Design an enzyme around this catalytic site. Structure first.
Site, mmCIF file in Angstrom:
data_model
loop_
_atom_site.group_PDB
_atom_site.id
_atom_site.type_symbol
_atom_site.label_atom_id
_atom_site.label_comp_id
_atom_site.label_asym_id
_atom_site.label_seq_id
_atom_site.Cartn_x
_atom_site.Cartn_y
_atom_site.Cartn_z
ATOM 1 N N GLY A 85 0.758 -1.220 -0.019
ATOM 2 C CA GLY A 85 0.077 0.097 -0.056
ATOM 3 C C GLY A 85 0.827 1.499 0.141
ATOM 4 N N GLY A 124 2.641 2.536 2.093
ATOM 5 C CA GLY A 124 2.552 3.316 3.721
ATOM 6 C C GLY A 124 1.243 3.993 3.790
ATOM 7 C CE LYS A 168 -1.394 0.321 10.890
ATOM 8 N NZ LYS A 168 -2.380 0.936 11.108
ATOM 9 C CG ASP A 177 -11.737 6.858 6.471
ATOM 10 O OD1 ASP A 177 -12.060 7.681 5.571
ATOM 11 O OD2 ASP A 177 -10.357 6.399 6.856
HETATM 12 C C1 LIG Z 1 -3.135 -2.405 3.277
HETATM 13 C C2 LIG Z 1 -3.804 -3.872 3.082
HETATM 14 C C3 LIG Z 1 -3.663 -4.385 1.802
HETATM 15 C C4 LIG Z 1 -3.398 -3.774 0.565
HETATM 16 C C5 LIG Z 1 -3.981 -2.387 0.104
HETATM 17 C C6 LIG Z 1 -3.360 -1.870 -0.987
HETATM 18 C C7 LIG Z 1 -2.421 -2.301 -1.544
HETATM 19 N N1 LIG Z 1 -1.945 -1.407 -2.741
HETATM 20 C C8 LIG Z 1 -1.602 -3.250 -1.367
HETATM 21 C C9 LIG Z 1 -0.654 -3.948 -2.260
HETATM 22 O O1 LIG Z 1 0.622 -3.476 -1.966
HETATM 23 N N2 LIG Z 1 -0.820 -5.160 -2.926
HETATM 24 C C10 LIG Z 1 0.406 -5.588 -3.806
HETATM 25 C C11 LIG Z 1 -2.097 -5.837 -2.815
HETATM 26 C C12 LIG Z 1 -2.156 -4.313 -0.254
HETATM 27 F F1 LIG Z 1 -1.579 -5.313 0.437
HETATM 28 C C13 LIG Z 1 -4.440 -5.447 1.834
HETATM 29 N N3 LIG Z 1 -4.706 -6.375 2.540
HETATM 30 C C14 LIG Z 1 -4.708 -5.780 3.766
HETATM 31 C C15 LIG Z 1 -4.288 -4.704 4.022
HETATM 32 C C16 LIG Z 1 -4.504 -4.352 5.557
HETATM 33 C C17 LIG Z 1 -5.162 -5.583 6.119
HETATM 34 N N4 LIG Z 1 -5.396 -6.603 4.847
HETATM 35 C C18 LIG Z 1 -5.003 -3.092 6.050
HETATM 36 C C19 LIG Z 1 -3.617 -3.429 6.606
#
Ligand SMILES: Cc1c(-c2ccc(N)c(C(=O)N(C)C)c2F)cnc2c1C1(C=N2)CC1
Ligand SMILES: Cc1c(-c2ccc(N)c(C(=O)N(C)C)c2F)cnc2c1C1(C=N2)CC1
Lengths: 291, 287
Positions: free
Chosen positions: A22, A24, A44, A135
């Site tokens: 994501g 950050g 996280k 949100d």
């Molecule tokens: C942040 C997040 C994400 C996520 C969201 C956007 C993204 N761009 C990516 C990514 O980098 N990918 C290569 C898919 C990602 F992994 C996917 N599942 C998750 C989370 C959380 C718990 N489950 C909230 C913490």
């Protein structure tokens, strides 16, 4: 105590940290692979120095822990070791809808309708537990590889919940307080129907790649919304969307929260109760995402 | 504050004794070393200073007989000293905790003076938000002054700082934005607080004082909450019972303003002068 079920062990002994996720935007979240299994998880990590307040962190975990619903991102547990807290959650392989549509372009009306039904199912569960997301947006709606829609990031929900609890714990003497002042102290001045509005905005976002008024200064947007003649937003291209979608936008974007329909009421709307809605729509979107 | 004194306040003042038992903070009775006049100096240890800055701005822009007067501020050695008018009898709570319950006439005079102060504050778009016996001060002349804008400043400072850190509002509902800009209530809360205070001066406690404070907040929101009343019905006149009834109007949209309340029978009746409190203070000295 942050949590009575904390694993007092370092997660790196059970997980291979793979890559950052994501950018950050969601914090220091890593994709991680189990060692004895292949199972993938999102981890996280939050720094935990002794003199920090962990009140907001504890509420977010409790909110995630207490949700067991197919449209809310799954929670596995928390690790505490060497002044680092690792929150372990389901890994959603496709990222958020915002990541997706920045690649595929605007979603079809059917895909938007599927998303709205799935988020409404999650919001109905949250609201039935007296929880408010506060949100809802494309970035906080994650899609996993199975094509499932999961709400994520209750950070704002925790900040508000701990902020109101802080003022309540040190409320002092309310014996001279006025009933409306007491209501705002306990209830915060709005209710869960703010999520319904945010969903309506999100549906426009999925249709247009931007929320309405996205080029306007944030303080000017707050300023416009609080005037008597405020006009709720609408879809740009009228002829691109059915009347059912227009009516869905119209009712979710009701000005007065006293007339805005609930998540359950909205589940009976023509747009999200139509038979052509199934996960195949999302799996089709992921195929396009793979190019 | 450009008018701030950059010196030790003890250059100008002789510190005589601590006031209010610390309930109001570090407040000192002090004598002007050239005038002989008496002042009250509050010492604040000074991080964020926006709340304290707002409390002083509220104070110095008040020029009204029923609001404790502001004389100036000293900044010296990480201490800010706020110099104010000294009310030699303390607060009504200090008084009725020795004299007992006030007479209706004394209460009526108190209410008129507070409404005068509240009407001035509201005409400045200020909200007191902490009206109660402990914040209604009395000088040796029997005059009445509203004091301590600590809560008021906090509510103003929290609402401004949240606007500074609101985030992106594009997905936000309008009622969420209205709370971020306007808080959720208005100046008519002070009218309710005055009604409870009137009962406090009559019965030596506010209603529900023996109830846990959080449960009190809960009962006030049950959507069927009933405004309190005076316990001894025959002890008080119908003007007092009606005054309590209208100041304790549940809906804020229907609760009368301070200015309107100033024309109520209880506070417009004759004989309401500081002599009523001179009698109270003499009872404090003798009885
Ligand atoms: C942040 C997040 C994400 C996520 C969201 C956007 C993204 N761009 C990516 C990514 O980098 N990918 C290569 C898919 C990602 F992994 C996917 N599942 C998750 C989370 C959380 C718990 N489950 C909230 C913490
Ligand atoms: C706090 C206060 C008081 C006060 C209140 C209660 C008291 N019990 C006493 C006291 O101790 N007395 C011996 C009279 C007292 F001085 C008197 N004028 C004041 C103040 C302030 C500015 N002017 C608000 C800060």
């Amino acid at each position: 105590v942050v949590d009575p079920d904390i694993f007092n062990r370092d997660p790196r002994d059970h997980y291979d940290l793979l890559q950052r996720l994501g950018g950050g935007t969601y914090g220091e979240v890593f994709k991680a692979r189990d060692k004895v299994s292949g199972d993938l998880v999102a981890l996280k990590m939050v720094k935990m120095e002794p003199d920090d307040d962990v009140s907001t962190l504890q509420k977010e975990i409790l909110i995630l822990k207490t949700c067991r619903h197919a449209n809310i991102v799954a929670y596995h547990g928390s690790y505490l070791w060497l002044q680092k807290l690792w929150i372990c959650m389901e890994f959603c392989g496709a990222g958020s809808l915002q990541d997706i549509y920045q690649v595929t372009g605007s979603l079809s009306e059917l895909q938007i309708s599927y998303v709205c039904r799935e988020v409404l199912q999650g919001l109905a569960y949250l609201h039935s537990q007296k929880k408010i997301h506060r949100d809802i947006k494309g970035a906080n709606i994650l899609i996993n590889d199975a094509g499932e829609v999961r709400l994520a990031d209750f950070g704002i929900s925790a900040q508000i919940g701990a902020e109101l609890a802080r003022r309540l714990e040190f409320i002092g003497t309310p014996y001279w307080m006025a009933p409306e002042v007491a209501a705002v102290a306990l209830k915060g001045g709005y209710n869960e129907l703010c999520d319904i509005w945010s969903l309506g905005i999100t549906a426009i976002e999925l249709a247009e790649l931007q929320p309405p008024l996205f080029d306007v200064h944030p303080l000017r947007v707050l300023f416009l919304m609080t005037k008597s003649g405020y006009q709720p937003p609408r879809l740009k291209e009228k002829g691109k969307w059915s009347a059912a979608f227009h009516n869905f936008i119209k009712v979710t974007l009701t000005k007065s929260p006293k007339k805005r329909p609930s998540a359950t009421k909205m589940l009976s709307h023509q747009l999200v109760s139509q038979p052509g809605l199934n996960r195949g729509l999302i799996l089709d979107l992921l195929d396009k995402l793979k190019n």
